[PDB]
Amino acid sequence: MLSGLNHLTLAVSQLAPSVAFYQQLLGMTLHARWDSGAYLSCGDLWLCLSLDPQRRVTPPEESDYTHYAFSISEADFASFAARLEAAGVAVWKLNRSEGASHYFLDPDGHKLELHVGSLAQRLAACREQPYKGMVFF
Amino acid sequence: MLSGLNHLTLAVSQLAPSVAFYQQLLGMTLHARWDSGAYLSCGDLWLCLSLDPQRRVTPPEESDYTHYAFSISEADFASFAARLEAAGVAVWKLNRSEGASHYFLDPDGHKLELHVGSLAQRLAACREQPYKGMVFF
Numbered sequence: 421m422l423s424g425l426n427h428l429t430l431a432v433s434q435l436a437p438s439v440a441f442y443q444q445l446l447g448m449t450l451h452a453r454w455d456s457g458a459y460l461s462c463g464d465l466w467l468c469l470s471l472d473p474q475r476r477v478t479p480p481e482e483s484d485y486t487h488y489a490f491s492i493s494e495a496d497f498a499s500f501a502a503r504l505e506a507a508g509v510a511v512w513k514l515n516r517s518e519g520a521s522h523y524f525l526d527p528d529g530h531k532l533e534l535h536v537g538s539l540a541q542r543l544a545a546c547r548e549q550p551y552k553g554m555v556f557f
Numbered sequence: 558m559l560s561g562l563n564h565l566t567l568a569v570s571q572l573a574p575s576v577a578f579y580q581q582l583l584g585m586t587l588h589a590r591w592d593s594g595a596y597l598s599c600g601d602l603w604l605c606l607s608l609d610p611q612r613r614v615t616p617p618e619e620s621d622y623t624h625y626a627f628s629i630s631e632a633d634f635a636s637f638a639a640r641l642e643a644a645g646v647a648v649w650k651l652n653r654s655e656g657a658s659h660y661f662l663d664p665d666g667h668k669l670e671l672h673v674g675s676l677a678q679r680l681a682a683c684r685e686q687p688y689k690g691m692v693f694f
């Protein structure tokens with residue numbers, strides 16, 4: 421039986437700016453760094469950055485909707501989003517189709533998101549404003 | 558401050574086989590489905606499948622090392638790997654690291670993994686046998 425996400429591994433093209441982005445800009449905890457990667461945590465999430473010569477810097481119009489959302493509190497959301505904006509962090513989506521979210525890109529174009537709220541809260545919101553054809557189990 | 562992974566969203570080319578894969582084959586809980594996606598959970602993980610015509614069914618040689626690892630106990634690992642093998646699920650890598658790992662592909666070529674072991678376990682092993690260039694914090 422599967423019990424959750426053990427880790428998220430992101431392929432990166434340049435290790436140093438990617439470590440800086442996740443550690444310095446996003447505030448995640450850096451545990452170790454080596455010539456080809458780094459291990460960070462974000463709460464219980466184990467994040468691995470893996471240096472990969474195959475990774476390309478990808479504009480958001482060239483990638484699909486696969487994305488990674490990080491939890492942030494209602495009290496912290498707006499100022500964190502505004503700080504990313506003021507720092508010049510690129511974006512990829514503006515319309516809030518799944519609640520309170522800020523959509524932004526990492527240095528390689530990985531699609532990231534700040535989101536306020538749990539799955540239970542999103543299901544409750546969807547009952548009132550459901551997506552087309554929505555069924556709840 | 559970011560407090561964890563809020564959700565993982567995978568773009569999918571065909572919703573029905575992706576739901577069958579994550580719900581029926583992998584045993585995740587299906588909470589809701591709509592015309593263009595689904596919400597599932599796996600322990601604390603909130604997974605969203607998003608129907609996206611831009612998703613390509615991508616051979617593993619054509620994607621980078623970005624991947625998503627799910628937790629499983631050591632005791633359950635071999636029978637879950639055998640379940641995936643019975644269903645003909647392709648493997649994209651052999652394990653050569655600490656902790657059991659099974660590297661498998663979803664219907665669209667998303668790179669997945671079953672892994673046994675925590676970040677703390679990995680860091681302890683790395684302390685004893687550090688990777689090239691490894692620094693701890």
Ligand SMILES: Cn1c(=O)oc2cc(N)ccc21
Binds near residue numbers: 453455
């Ligand atoms: C700046 N820095 C650091 O904090 O840990 C490192 C490890 C390596 N391999 C190279 C550079 C660093």
Ligand SMILES: [Mn+2]
Binds near residue numbers: 487489518533564566
């Ligand atoms: Mn999202």
Ligand SMILES: [Mn+2]
Binds near residue numbers: 429624626
């Ligand atoms: Mn892995």
